[PDB]
Design an enzyme around this catalytic site. Sequence first.
Site, mmCIF file in Angstrom:
data_model
loop_
_atom_site.group_PDB
_atom_site.id
_atom_site.type_symbol
_atom_site.label_atom_id
_atom_site.label_comp_id
_atom_site.label_asym_id
_atom_site.label_seq_id
_atom_site.Cartn_x
_atom_site.Cartn_y
_atom_site.Cartn_z
ATOM 1 N N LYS A 109 -54.671 9.822 10.294
ATOM 2 C CA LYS A 109 -53.213 9.921 9.801
ATOM 3 C C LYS A 109 -52.874 11.285 9.059
ATOM 4 O O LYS A 109 -53.705 11.282 7.867
ATOM 5 C CB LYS A 109 -52.538 8.666 8.983
ATOM 6 N N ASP A 235 -43.263 -1.847 0.435
ATOM 7 C CA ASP A 235 -43.111 -1.309 1.649
ATOM 8 C C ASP A 235 -44.016 -1.371 2.586
ATOM 9 O O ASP A 235 -44.004 -0.905 3.848
ATOM 10 C CB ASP A 235 -42.624 0.077 1.306
#
Lengths: 303, 319
Positions: A109, A235
């Site tokens: 990523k 989150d």
Amino acid sequence: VKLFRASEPILSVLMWGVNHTINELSNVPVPVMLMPDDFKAYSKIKVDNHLFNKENLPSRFKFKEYCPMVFRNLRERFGIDDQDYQNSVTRSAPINRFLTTYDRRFVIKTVSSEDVAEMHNILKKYHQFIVECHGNTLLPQFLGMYRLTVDGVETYMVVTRAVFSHRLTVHRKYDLKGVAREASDKEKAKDLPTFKDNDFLNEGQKLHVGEESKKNFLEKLKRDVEFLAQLKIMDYSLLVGIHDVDRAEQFGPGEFDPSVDVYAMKSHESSPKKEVYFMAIIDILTPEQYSKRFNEFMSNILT
Amino acid sequence: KVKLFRASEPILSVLMWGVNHTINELSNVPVPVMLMPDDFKAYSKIKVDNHLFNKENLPSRFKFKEYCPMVFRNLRERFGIDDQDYQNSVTRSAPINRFLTTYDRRFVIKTVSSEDVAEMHNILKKYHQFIVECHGNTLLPQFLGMYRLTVDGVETYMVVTRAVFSHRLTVHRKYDLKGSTVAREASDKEKAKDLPTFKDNDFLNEGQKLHVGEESKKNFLEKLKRDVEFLAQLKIMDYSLLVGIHDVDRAEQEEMEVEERAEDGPGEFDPSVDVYAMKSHESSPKKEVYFMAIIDILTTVNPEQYSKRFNEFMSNILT
Ligand SMILES: Nc1nc2c(ncn2[C@@H]2O[C@H](COP(=O)(O)O)[C@@H](O)[C@H]2O)c(=O)[nH]1
Ligand SMILES: Nc1nc2c(ncn2[C@@H]2O[C@H](COP(=O)(O)O)[C@@H](O)[C@H]2O)c(=O)[nH]1
Ligand SMILES: Nc1nc2c(ncn2[C@@H]2O[C@H](COP(=O)(O)O)[C@@H](O)[C@H]2O)c(=O)[nH]1
């Protein structure tokens, strides 16, 4: 004979750099313990090749690796062999930034400056946690962190163990957080539909894995989110893949290597459709509230 | 297989690290059909800044440059030297004795000047073609690598060559012959070393000769004939014939003595390894092995003359 041929110079440099650093570490003795400096350390290499080796690689690039000793330790504790890791990155260009090694075993990523800072912020506690739980966790498995520099532009990367199998096709995923979260009309139509917690509970879908797995899973999911709390993070979702054995049955199907697809789970004899579930925590770089909320919504899927 | 690159000095570790790195990297570079002109202007460069990491042998910071990597890889093939061998001789253990040898005595490592590196580039095109059309049969220095190292901001240039002397057979007397009619002899200083580098007049006043036998004399004088003309085709002067003499019987005793010292075949070699070696004529006084090569070609007399002179001297050195 690695060419590092990639659709994009950044990728080739990534292959070059992972290759270089893994090689380099192989001449570096594995230590009896990590030290405080290991968490502040890095490697930097700047390349400047005049008129040589230019076919796949840029002539000038930088490659930095963060805390190579810690991440190499992390690899071991996650049961990943450095030369396997290396071969996955270097043998062929990663593919589709959010990439996977060509053998769908690792995810790469792109991340931000602050991502890399947060990583440094939690790394010692995360190492300590990996140690303590003996690498048994639903948390992302961080394998390497790098900064590439190509054409003046710095790019940050983070390598994790892939969540989804590198073989068994997923047929339905669900990004879960435990408000209002459904799949947008602009997404609802695609080869791979990325759902959310609302379209799930309202879809009367459940994951039948037996009370024996509910025991491992939850007993892990609890200490994991408890850990993220003490780190004051939130989150983070729970990525969930489903693999209907039949849909692909159309060598054996539903067959998988638990040592490689570490996130996989077999359904129970006492279950409806025959499937393989892949479940892990994602996105942890960013209250006791979010934790207990998360834990609750996820206990309810495990019958 | 851990290479610590441990060495008595930072410079050496960096050298080991660099030769290792560049050789591996070359191993991912396909072998060209031919060399391209740019290959003679090419270089690779790497700068390392390791923070809090990997500091036990290597410096944290350093630069390594390799000149015209493609051409020297080829020079290596053309001398029947395998890259992995080269790499191993440099990296398996620290070089030793600005003159170094690899731990196994196969390769020599000269510290040269910026000027020298500069002269390498001038002659590099013409040198390569020469090696091509002599298929590697030459008394000339055989160049395997040229590098620049940076340690503590200080730059050191190195040239690697094949060793002239045998990796195994001991040398008992060496010479540096030129032919120059000026006085060349060995200082009373040198003379009192272990292995004095004797000169022209010493060789003469000693009445020394080397008995190599005719098949060998012809092939050597033929190498030398074309070698020293090629040199003359360039501005090059004042280079030398390095002459080592190995005494087979003397070595055989020395070996014997070394066994009884620790406890408390003879005269032969691989002409594919000890490339400069020559056996003495079966009709020779003592059983001997000679090593003969040209050295120092980088750094009222002139090139064409030197070649004719140098050639005539050497030719009268052997029988
Ligand atoms: N002819 C030639 N000389 C070079 C080349 N590269 C470096 N040199 C010379 O080699 C010496 C060392 O240069 P450096 O690599 O430290 O810049 C200097 O004398 C420099 O001018 C080249 O490509 N061609
Ligand atoms: N660094 C570098 N130096 C060069 C290059 N070409 C020539 N030089 C240097 O500049 C001088 C030019 O001389 P020439 O090219 O006329 O023989 C040489 O002495 C050498 O030191 C080059 O391409 N790179
Ligand atoms: N030429 C020659 N010298 C020898 C031989 N054996 C011993 N010597 C020499 O005689 C001396 C005494 O020999 P040692 O027996 O103490 O090794 C030493 O100088 C040694 O080199 C031999 O077989 N040949």
